[PDB]
Amino acid sequence: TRIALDPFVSDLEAESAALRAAGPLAAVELPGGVPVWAVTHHAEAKKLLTDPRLVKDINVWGAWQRGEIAPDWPLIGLANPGRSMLTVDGADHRRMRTLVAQALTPRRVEQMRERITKLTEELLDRLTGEVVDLKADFAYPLPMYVVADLMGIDEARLPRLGELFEKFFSTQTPPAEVIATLTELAGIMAETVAAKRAAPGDDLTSALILASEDGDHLTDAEIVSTLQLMVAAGHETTISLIVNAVVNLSTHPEQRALVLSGEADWSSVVEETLRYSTPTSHVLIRFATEDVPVGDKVLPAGDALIVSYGALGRDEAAHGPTAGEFDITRSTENRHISFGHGPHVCPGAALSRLEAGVALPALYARFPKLDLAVPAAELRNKPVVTQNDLFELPVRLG
């Protein structure tokens, strides 16, 4: 009675309906035959996300500990990553979140509004021809320029950063090319850190160096791991939020009208896109330190849990009978948790909301008649089981 996730992501819509149906705790299989549990309902997901018995520490994974996980298992980079904010819980995690919150403040993100507006303008200025790949030509570059600027990376590096991001995020990318891509990116982050120690500025890197709580502060290794984690966490997710809002407005033309008229605000489009069509379908991975009741089921000690944000986004218990539809007018007594919940909640939420909040009005300002150059049915998800990313967004600028 175990749902196997399509590594080709041929039918997300259905796979998400099957996960919602298989109760709050669904037995699933990850690509490579690895069995785990998925929490697929909203209220149960919030309970597990704040339960200190669900930890990131891979030592707690019984299957891993007793060697039944292939060392070449494709998803092992997700299950077993380098030490960061991502992989710790309890006091160690609270220390990192406190220090990071001092640097990536709502104020610092809000202060990016003008630079993002200018980066959006220049990308739109480069769009030419009657149809474009709006993903490759507009959405894709925007978050790279934004994060480079946020982090204070040498503007000279941007042409190479474009190539390193493509390599880091690409399916095709081979074995010891991805080793070498990580190495080069870490070298850039280390240079940026050393630059900002010598000459502190108004950038996130400078603030991560300055952050402290009663004389406790981040190590160089902690600062670099934080900058790398933010690039990994923030790039394709923000692209897919923009891509998915354009896809949603295009297939709900009466809501596009409502937003273009000024009756509906852009925030309502972004918040609805996040609930209805999150860029992050699944987050790996947590392990139970003890048996944990979830509904009428038990998550056993040493078993794995994934959080199925995609599926639970359209949870009718949270969002009512409309849950399964895109509606930017909707009222929910339950805010979406597409940025997570509890200690590990996304620290980038304000920034991705700001990028989309600037990009979407700017694009429709330049091309208010823009639409899909192809039927919605022809749009393809990339073969990335944890993400909701499209190969391309063919658009007629109009």
Residues that constitute the known binding site for heme b: 93, 97, 286, 309, 344, 346
Q: Which residue is nearest to ligand HEM (CB)?
A: 348
SS (H, E, C) 164-192: HHHHHHCCCCCCHHHHHHHHHHHHHHHHH
Integer Cα distance of 361 and 314 in angstroms: 26
Integer Cα distance of 297 and 52 in angstroms: 18
Minimum CB separation from ligand HEM for residue 207, in Å?
A: 13
Q: Is 344 in the site for ligand HEM (CB under 6 A)?
A: yes
Nearest to 228 by CA among 73, 85, 55: 85
Q: Is 352 in the site for ligand HEM (CB under 6 A)?
A: yes
Minimum CB separation from ligand HEM for residue 134, in Å?
A: 17
Residues in Cβ contact with 171 at an 8 Å cutoff, skipping those fewer than 6 apart = 382, 383, 384
Stretch that binds ligand HEM, among 24-32, 165-173, 213-221, 272-280 (CB under 6 A): 272-280
Q: Is 340 in the site for ligand HEM (CB under 6 A)?
A: yes
Q: Is 310 in the site for ligand HEM (CB under 6 A)?
A: no
Q: How far apart are the first and last CA of the chain?
A: 48
Stretch that binds ligand HEM, among 160-168, 257-265, 278-286, 388-396 (CB under 6 A): 278-286
**CB-wise, 3 or 150, nearer to ligand HEM?**
150
* Burial class of residue 378 (count of CB atoms within 10 Å of its CB; 0-12, 13-18, 19+): exposed
Q: Is the peptide bond before 69 cis (omega within 30 degrees of 0)?
A: no
Token representation of residue 311: 């599926």
Binding mask 147-186 for ligand HEM (x = CB under 6 A): ----------------------------------------
Minimum CB separation from ligand HEM for residue 396, in Å?
A: 26
Query: Contact positions toward ligand HEM, by CB under 6 A?
Result: 85-86, 229-230, 233-234, 237-238, 241, 278-280, 283, 307, 309, 338-340, 344, 346-348, 351-352
